[PDB]
Amino acid sequence: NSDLDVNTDIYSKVLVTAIYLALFVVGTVGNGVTLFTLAQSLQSRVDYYLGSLALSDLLILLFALPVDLYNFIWVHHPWAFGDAGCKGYYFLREACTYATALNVVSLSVELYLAICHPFKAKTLMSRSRTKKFISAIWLASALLAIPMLFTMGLQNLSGDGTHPGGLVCTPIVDTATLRVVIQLNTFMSFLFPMLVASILNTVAARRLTVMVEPGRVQALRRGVLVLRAVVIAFVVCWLPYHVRRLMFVYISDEQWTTALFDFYHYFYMLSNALVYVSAAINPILYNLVSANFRQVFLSTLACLC
Amino acid sequence: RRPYI
């Protein structure tokens, strides 16, 4: 009884709490004012993509954060929400990850096509078809996020399973299928797409150096660098997250001691913190490099006040 | 003792 509790420093709890607060405010204000700011020849399309990205960021920040703070870090048990809360939460997370990844890859594609083939850069995707492609990204992401509605659930692990304080939002499915779905998310929402995006970034950079209306290159290069920053930040932030989930299953029960338990939890704090950092980092990467986005940002926040 | 989160 009550063994389901987690040994975590109160100092660390308050730490990640404050951190999550900062990331929450910064990310929410950033992506929000970004979305209001978004409201053109080509940049309209990349504005739609950035719209999708900042939207996903807003989803994770607004919705996933307070759930994470309350139960995952502070409460531990019992799960206070409903099953729809759990399944919906994980589904939301995964869908957001897939959406983000697809947005990034598609952005790399459209950038490469923009710089290398300007003749086909106007005909390839009209804004209508672009929005259709965005909705396509959303729905596909949902389809890929579907397993979480089946994988995750609730189990009473109070030993007898009768004690109310033992209710836990946990994966109901077996260890094997768990390994399977974790692999699915790791490959499709991280490894493969970021690999493709990195490749397209390398090629874009090389052919950019090859290509070198002279002023236009100054803007497109800016685009490239921004993309690079986004990609590297993504991979570097999501890497321990996926490893943690791999760690979660690739370690046997006999190997699972209290040390690896608490360590897994501090690593959870760390990795998730890095995730929310990756969420809030986008508008900062936009403002810093673009300057114009920053001036109109300041203009709009001056409009609100 | 396997974690549940």
Side-chain angles (χ1 to χ4, degrees), chain A residues 1-39 41-305, chain B:
Chain A
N1 176 257
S2 297
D3 296 341
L4 285 59
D5 61 343
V6 178
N7 299 124
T8 303
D9 310 327
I10 308 179
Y11 304 146
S12 60
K13 295 183 180 181
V14 177
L15 175 61
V16 295
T17 302
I19 294 176
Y20 282 11
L21 295 175
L23 297 176
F24 176 77
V25 179
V26 169
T28 300
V29 172
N31 299 277
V33 177
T34 303
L35 273 187
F36 181 78
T37 300
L38 290 189
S41 60
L42 181 144
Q43 87 173 11
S44 55
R45 298 169 179 92
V46 311
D47 284 17
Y48 286 114
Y49 284 102
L50 265 56
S52 178
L53 282 170
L55 183 57
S56 172
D57 301 342
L58 279 183
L59 295 179
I60 308 173
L61 288 161
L62 272 305
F63 300 96
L65 268 171
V67 176
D68 193 28
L69 278 165
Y70 177 77
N71 272 330
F72 291 146
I73 283 98
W74 282 114
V75 165
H76 305 294
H77 63 88
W79 177 258
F81 301 103
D83 199 348
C86 173
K87 296 177 173 297
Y89 167 81
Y90 288 85
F91 177 82
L92 179 61
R93 291 184 61 93
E94 296 266 335
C96 281
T97 60
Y98 288 117
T100 300
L102 291 179
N103 286 316
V104 170
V105 179
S106 54
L107 269 172
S108 303
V109 173
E110 194 206 355
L111 181 61
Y112 170 84
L113 294 180
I115 58 161
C116 294
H117 301 75
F119 186 84
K120 293 87 178 181
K122 186 76 166 186
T123 179
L124 85 173
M125 289 200 127
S126 326
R127 298 186 273 255
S128 64
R129 307 302 178 179
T130 301
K131 295 183 298 181
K132 293 178 178 65
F133 188 82
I134 298 297
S135 291
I137 293 177
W138 292 348
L139 288 166
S141 307
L143 292 178
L144 298 179
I146 290 179
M148 290 297 142
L149 300 172
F150 296 158
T151 301
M152 292 305 299
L154 279 70
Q155 291 184 342
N156 198 321
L157 306 181
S158 59
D160 48 13
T162 69
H163 303 164
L167 184 63
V168 158
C169 180
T170 205
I172 53 183
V173 307
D174 326 45
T175 59
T177 58
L178 183 59
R179 296 176 61 180
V180 173
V181 293
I182 293 289
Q183 284 169 197
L184 306 193
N185 173 258
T186 305
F187 283 121
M188 295 304 129
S189 167
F190 183 76
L191 285 182
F192 175 81
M194 289 307 106
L195 180 54
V196 174
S198 63
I199 289 173
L200 295 176
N201 276 262
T202 303
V203 176
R206 291 183 180 182
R207 299 199 177 182
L208 185 33
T209 57
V210 167
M211 287 311 171
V212 175
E213 214 186 36
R216 180 186 48 95
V217 312
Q218 187 176 359
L220 66 84
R221 283 184 303 103
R222 168 184 70 178
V224 172
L225 87 88
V226 167
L227 184 62
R228 187 65 51 84
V230 170
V231 169
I232 183 178
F234 188 92
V235 47
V236 80
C237 287
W238 290 92
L239 179 77
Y241 170 80
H242 291 269
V243 164
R244 181 189 55 81
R245 290 170 46 249
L246 291 173
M247 169 188 179
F248 176 79
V249 208
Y250 267 90
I251 301 183
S252 179
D253 294 325
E254 307 86 24
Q255 299 171 312
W256 279 112
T257 181
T258 59
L260 283 182
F261 187 80
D262 297 321
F263 168 74
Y264 177 84
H265 293 69
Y266 286 103
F267 186 46
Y268 178 86
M269 301 167 72
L270 183 70
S271 63
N272 282 259
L274 296 177
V275 168
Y276 297 119
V277 163
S278 179
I281 200 62
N282 295 128
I284 306 178
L285 293 180
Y286 303 153
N287 288 28
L288 263 65
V289 193
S290 194
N292 53 4
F293 295 168
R294 187 185 329 120
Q295 73 186 11
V296 66
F297 196 98
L298 213 166
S299 301
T300 49
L301 70 85
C303 290
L304 190 270
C305 178
Chain B
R1 183 174 176 175
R2 174 179 296 271
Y4 49 82
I5 304 179

